[PDB]
Amino acid sequence: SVASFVLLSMVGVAVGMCMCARRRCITPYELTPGATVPFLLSLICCIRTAKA
Amino acid sequence: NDCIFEVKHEGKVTGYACLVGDKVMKPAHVKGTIDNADLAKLAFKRSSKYDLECAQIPVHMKSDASKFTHEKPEGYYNWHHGAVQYSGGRFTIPTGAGKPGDSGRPIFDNKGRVVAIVLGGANEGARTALSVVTWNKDIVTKITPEGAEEW
């Protein structure tokens, strides 16, 4: 039980701080008008475009 | 000059929010819930290292948004409280022209296009250098001269 809890907590920390990295890398593009996010970066960070 | 769209956010006014490009933005250092009751329900993306919350304008109001351009020639520009000198890549105004509460006011070029949003100033003699949110090609940025307090 302790090992399962530790490993699940590590996985949760990994995904949460991956989300944190996503937010940090994405917010400046969502602040800049025009939002010409390259398609490769949209695929990598799994985002939607604001201009359709 | 020809555009007054800096929407207030509080009965006790401390700064203003603005519509430019396809986005509403406001400095993140000033408290309050944006008025007009249409932008209030909008969800804001916040950046503390940029000190700015921004959101997508609703379509029905985005015709009210001001024009945008990232290109900044050296020389004079206009804003609500007068003229701004862009020298050495830095904006400056006469001392006393800006006070706490005028943060978030867009700076316009000769065509009337937004190039920057004021956040504060630093007092050097008869002049004050502006800590200001501006842009370069596809990326927001901030210029903070030493000793500037937040407006």
Place this chain on the structure above:
Amino acid sequence: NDCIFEVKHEGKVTGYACLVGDKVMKPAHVKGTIDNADLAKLAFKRSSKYDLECAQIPVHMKSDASKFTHEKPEGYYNWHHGAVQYSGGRFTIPTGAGKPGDSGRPIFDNKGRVVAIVLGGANEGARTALSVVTWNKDIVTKITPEGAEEW
């Protein structure tokens, strides 16, 4: 001028087809019959990704096809209904100029050249945003402002 062919549905006009370069183009969302029999009969090709509907002009007897240009400099253009303001990556039109069922009318530059084709619009407030189909040097693209409903 007068390079526009009417697309008539059974009981009314639904759209408009235009001769650009070597090809006749129509909005793929418009249901109806081409006014000219030689074009209504002509085997006709469909692409829903760009909502565009193409065929090759019988250039032996259609030498009046309009000329085109992929350049999109900032400023004013012609829409058979007034002046369109191409600003940023968008086209803006006076709200009362366009009506559903008028899709397919091209946008002209100041030289009489087709720059884009209106596929629809968005009730934008003080204006209307124009959702169009334009082209780069080699490829077509569709510009769809948010909130655009079908025309």
